[PDB]
Amino acid sequence: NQQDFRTPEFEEFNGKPDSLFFTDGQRRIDFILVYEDESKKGTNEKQKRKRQAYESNLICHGLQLEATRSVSDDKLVFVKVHAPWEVLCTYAEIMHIKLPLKFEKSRMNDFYSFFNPATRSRIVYFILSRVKYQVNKFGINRLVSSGIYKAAFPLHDCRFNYESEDISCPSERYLLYREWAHPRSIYKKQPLDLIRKYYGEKIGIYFAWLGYYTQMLLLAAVVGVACFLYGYLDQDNCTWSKEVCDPDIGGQILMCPQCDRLCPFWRLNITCESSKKLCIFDSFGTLIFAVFMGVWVTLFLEFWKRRQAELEYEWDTVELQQEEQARPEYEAQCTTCGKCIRVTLCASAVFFWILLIIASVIGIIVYRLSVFIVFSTTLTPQMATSITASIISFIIIMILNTIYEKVAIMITNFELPRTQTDYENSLTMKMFLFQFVNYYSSCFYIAFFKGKFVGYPGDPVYLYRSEECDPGGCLLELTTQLTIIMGGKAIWNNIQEVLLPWVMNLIGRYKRVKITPRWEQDYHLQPMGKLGLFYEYLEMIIQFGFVTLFVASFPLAPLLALVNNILEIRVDAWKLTTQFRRMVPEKAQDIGAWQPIMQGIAILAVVTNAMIIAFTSDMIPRLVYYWSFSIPPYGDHTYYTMDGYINNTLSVFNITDFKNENPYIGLGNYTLCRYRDFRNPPGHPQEYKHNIYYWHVIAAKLAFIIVMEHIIYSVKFFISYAIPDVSKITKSKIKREKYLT
Amino acid sequence: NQQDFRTPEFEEFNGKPDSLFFTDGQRRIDFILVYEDESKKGTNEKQKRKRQAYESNLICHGLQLEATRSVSDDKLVFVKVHAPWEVLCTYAEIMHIKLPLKFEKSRMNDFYSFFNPATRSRIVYFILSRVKYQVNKFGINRLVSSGIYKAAFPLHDCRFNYESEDISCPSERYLLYREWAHPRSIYKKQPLDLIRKYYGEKIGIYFAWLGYYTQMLLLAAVVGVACFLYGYLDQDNCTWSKEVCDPDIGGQILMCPQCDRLCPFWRLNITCESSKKLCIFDSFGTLIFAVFMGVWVTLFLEFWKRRQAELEYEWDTVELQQEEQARPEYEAQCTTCGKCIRVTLCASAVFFWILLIIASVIGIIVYRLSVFIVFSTTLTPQMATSITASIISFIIIMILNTIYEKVAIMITNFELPRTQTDYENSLTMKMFLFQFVNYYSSCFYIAFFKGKFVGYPGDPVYLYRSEECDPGGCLLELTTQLTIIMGGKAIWNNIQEVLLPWVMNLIGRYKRVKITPRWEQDYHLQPMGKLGLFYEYLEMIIQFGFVTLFVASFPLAPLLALVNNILEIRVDAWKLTTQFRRMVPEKAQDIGAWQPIMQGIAILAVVTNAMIIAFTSDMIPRLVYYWSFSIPPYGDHTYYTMDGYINNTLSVFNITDFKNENPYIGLGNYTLCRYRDFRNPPGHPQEYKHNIYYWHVIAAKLAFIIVMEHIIYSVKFFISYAIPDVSKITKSKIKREKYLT
Ligand SMILES: CCCCCCCCCC(=O)OC[C@@H](COP(=O)(O)OCC[N+](C)(C)C)OC(=O)CCCCCCCCC
Ligand SMILES: CCCCCCCCCC(=O)OC[C@@H](COP(=O)(O)OCC[N+](C)(C)C)OC(=O)CCCCCCCCC
Ligand SMILES: [Ca+2]
Ligand SMILES: [Ca+2]
Ligand SMILES: [Ca+2]
Ligand SMILES: [Ca+2]
Ligand SMILES: [Ca+2]
Ligand SMILES: [Ca+2]
């Protein structure tokens, strides 16, 4: 309970380059602790006065220790930590570690190299986190947080590129870099048993979920490519876009300008080329695919629950939850009624920053309104404006993402969560709320609030002059924004994931921190951090959002995400194998709070896809025209047909601007221009009021939302009721375990 | 393992009228078995050849037995079953019965009259169901099913009216009849600990759920009486019903007749009186109350989850689930692939009977259409028709209810569920599906499909001549139908619950099956059955439906259900205390499949209330008139006002019937009559087509459904997220148990 004997068989050794064992070769290295002492203001001795109080207690609890001085830094001392078999047995009786039995699997010790190095490192981390050093001081994480211990980590097995010098050691890192974690192995399956055996259940459940997500994205992408190619093969039979591109019809439709000054009266032919690709993006193929994706997200979640029950059997992820260690920052600071008011102030700060990113979207709006004029002066101006605004908004999103990463850490540190699980849950909800709003607010704007409230040419909506949409619809602008944000997020995040740990290791080598042992090799690496795969999970969840919430705009979002996921498995595996220091293995039975987040996104996606097809697509006005306004009482044709749709949908405007400016008489010499709204013609008794066709179309839009939402929610309820959550073979395996034991 | 010694210390005793102990007075009666043998075709001896094979094994497993002949029937033999302390201890070590500890509560035996008579009867029923008699024959339920044993039951404590003759015995039935189960005690609280102590966890959880449901119905009824009285106090300020009742305005509106022959052109004044009470039933009070009830059902379900976690602590309902005994009818009959096709045939028969009750509703439609003419010949005819049709449809519902009780038993017996829990789950889903459709199909018809598809006077919808609705709306017809069905179901079911076990006991006394002991007194009672409180639960769930799905029609459904529940607690408790034989206590941690059923009804109720307010109420056309058609572009008034609504909503019809009959020229000499639809006037370019006001109103109806559904579902999601499922004091009690143990 005191500091008398430390660091036994302390000697400097450098003879073996690749040895996971001690200098004697009897016992292996379960952990490495790293400190320095030899080089003010009374801080040094005081840490020496505390650090030894830890280490001696480690041998009073049974652990074997042995240090060597570092060969590069004379201050750095590497302490190898090993657990004897008796200490392993008692601290594996405390935590019910499930071992093979004669492979039947049961509690604290079973009948049968017995303990893998992964579960050995888990045992020694439990021991390292429990032992008291001292007021009451709890564990090792407080020492590493307080600058006492520089680094504590388990060792990797070998070099990832070269086979280990030991003949008895299985080169787990090398064989996991050859058959995984390498772009040479992009086609091969994932050795999920091997990656959990090397890494742990958190890493194994992330890569199992990522491989399953990629497999289901392959199905969604095949059906989406089928629907997109159905639109591409019916591209030549679209009546409305051919009528747009015809100069005898679509050329004559002279449109009103959108902004007040320095915007010309434009003919509809400049829409024409975009209109062609627009016929692929709101056809019946994207509607059928939106209904299919409403079914597919439920198949995804139900078969993930089945795969997760399969892994809860196969991997023994359901372990008894020991009482969790409190975080050191909580117990250092140590009423509850005031902590509640601190939490409310924290929530108000979070909603302040959410409203800041809303103001950033308002700034993007004002940018588009200012830059459309100068793009019309200096590939139509609105399409060029939309592509460059997508580029600029993606850059602003990536800039504000890092700033919220930092301030989300600060915001979650200001409130004090006692446990790491409560910390991660609060950070998960807060960080996802910002990433949701930050990544999808521009897309939700272009979908639901862009062009909807503009009014007619006389009396437009002034905030100044909210953005008017294209005659085809803002679906093409949404598709371009989605493609830019999704593909650029994939490319930029993969480039950052490749470079940033690699660049940090490179600058460490250049700061010079020839033959060298395993602990120095692993110490010159990047640590993952207390978060872990948080961000990894976050990224994919964002991608899931982009796949599901916005799938009615373009059906190639599963294909884009599938290409990204096929790259992402390898880039995550490569960085975790080579560039990162080895994490202690943990145990996780699910992906965490991300699964409630995904079920919430699945519920929201039905509403969002119905509102996309109704409001930002132009499928419902086309459908209503064909079925109701080409018949005799409202139209001239005898049978249902789609010709004359563009001439009979756009509304005429005589140049009568209200005197509450009158810009059109300066911008042109024309007297009548057509705009995209369904208001009455001039000279009506109710001129420029909403007409019978508008109210018919908006009733069909709302009836479509109602019918599609209720039908899809009922089909999702029936599919979730029909598919059992646990698989039949997994029930049989659990029943066979209960039968034998 | 064989039949050698049976029925020890067998003697006829009649000296003690009220003795729960044996003739010696040492040991108590845990069970009573009842058989008869002494009075063909070889059946008698064969049952004698089997019955003894049971009883001897009972003493080979340790139970003590003692029979007396009955004093009334010389054939009847009553066998008293007692468990010794050692047998109680071993079979309470098999099933982890939780006893007080020094009241801390833990497993198989604890430190401390020790076993209550309830848990003693539960132990002896476990023993009675496990012991083999014999091919393999399992337990006692097979003997009672096969006519071997006439009756097996635990004894009640005393007479319910009179205190027990024993001085040591607590008169549990009498004290539970004095402070509960008696209309004298209608105001008092429920002794929930005492009723679980006497009866078991299934009965205690039903009465805890019923008392909690009554308490929450008190809150819902107070707010509903507030909203109804707000409508009753604003009854004199309704502009539209006053305009209906005014003979200068509402008298002049001469309406078209509904059916083809023998129905007169009627003025709107005959609606007038109904219109007054109609102003209480679609006001803003019922709208505010519908939003409040969408919140209240979620508060109900969340606080039931909190009360249920409170009872899972306080009552020890979470016991280890022993492997359930298979049902005797399954194991008697004993491939699985053919059993699947039997299940599909069973499902097809169920949907055949559901479509039969749909045809019964179609017959009710044809009845109304036939009887409105003769009610117009022989209190307007449509209101008299609606009240008598509610009476006749309620009688037909009560007639078809019993028929489906019988055929649902037959349908669930045709498929073969192996376990009683799977049997009850399948019967719960099938029986609720029929009770749902049977009780609410007439109400859903009057709400959503009555008067909606009728067409204009020219070209009406012929099936013949689907029913036309009233100018105020079919909400008053729905309110009358709901009040009749709900109040009559309450009154009739309470009268049946009072009489039917009481009448069966009375006819048993009259068939004569003076001083008599406890086992004969309890044998001359009605057994509850293998179902138990199934039907009780069913009834209340139906009531819940009537409270929540249809709450927008009338706000006094919580008050009607609250009066019914205050009566229902006492009538259920009274019949279970006095008229029914004592059930063995069981263990239930929740109400069962009824809680998924209630969550489904809660989800459906939001949709149903939104569609009631939009479609079968007339609030949205009134609101659209006030906000949009009394302004200058569509109306004459300068400010928003509701006068002229009745004259400007109903549509004119010149008598131009299509020649595809022309009944109106025979039924009257009038040339123009007004009907309830929003079609264009005659002489229009689009005459009798739907107009701008119709499409405006239907767009507001669908936008109201969308806004109300999404707002209420979001508020319900936020309330379910904010309210934690387990209570804070209950977390503290569970943590204190984990702290002490
Ligand atoms: C909760 C997750 C997603 C929420 C997104 C909300 C969507 C809001 C968009 C919206 O309602 O737009 C208002 C109009 C749209 O009619 P449009 O004809 O698109 O407006 C004119 C556009 N044009 C001049 C270019 C021809 O539509 C109406 O006037 C009918 C109002 C019904 C909207 C209710 C939806 C959600 C309420 C919670
Ligand atoms: C799932 C649980 C409950 C389901 C109940 C479904 C409700 C069906 C009722 C319905 O849609 O009615 C059709 C019309 C109603 O317009 P009204 O103006 O009431 O019809 C004329 C009536 N009048 C002659 C006396 C003036 O409305 C329309 O034409 C718009 C159609 C939108 C209906 C979609 C709702 C549910 C779809 C799954
Ligand atoms: Ca990435
Ligand atoms: Ca990643
Ligand atoms: Ca499921
Ligand atoms: Ca009743
Ligand atoms: Ca009842
Ligand atoms: Ca909750």
Residue numbers in the entry:
A (entry chain A), B (entry chain B): 43 to 81, 87 to 149, 187 to 196, 202 to 223, 228 to 427, 445 to 488, 503 to 587, 591 to 640, ...
Paper text:
In platelets, scrambling is mediated by the protein TMEM16F, which catalyzes the externalization of phosphatidylserine (PS) in response to an increase in the intracellular Ca2+ concentration to trigger blood clotting. TMEM16F belongs to the TMEM16 protein family, whose members either function as Ca2+ activated anion-selective channels or as Ca2+ activated lipid scramblases. By combining data from cryo-electron microscopy, in vitro scrambling assays and electrophysiology, our study has provided insight into the diverse functional behavior of mTMEM16F, a member of the TMEM16 family that facilitates the transport of lipids and ions across cellular membranes. Both processes are controlled by the binding of Ca2+ to a site located within the transmembrane domain that is accessible from the cytoplasm and they are mediated by the same structural element located at the periphery of each subunit.
The structure of mTMEM16F in the presence of Ca2+ defines the location of two Ca2+ ions in each subunit that are bound to a site which strongly resembles its counterpart in nhTMEM16 and mTMEM16A. In this site, conserved acidic and polar residues located on α-helices 6–8 coordinate the ions with similar geometry. In the presence of Ca2+, the bound ligands provide an interaction platform for negatively charged and polar residues on α6, thereby immobilizing the helix in the observed conformation. The structure of the putative catalytic unit of mTMEM16F in a Ca2+-bound conformation shows a strong resemblance to the ion permeation path in mTMEM16A, where an hourglass-shaped pore contains two aqueous vestibules on either side of the membrane that are bridged by a narrow neck. A related architecture is observed in mTMEM16F, where closer interactions between α-helices and the presence of bulky residues along the path further constrict the pore below the size of permeating ions. Further towards the cytoplasm, the bulky Tyr 563 lowers the pore diameter of mTMEM16F to 1.6 Å.
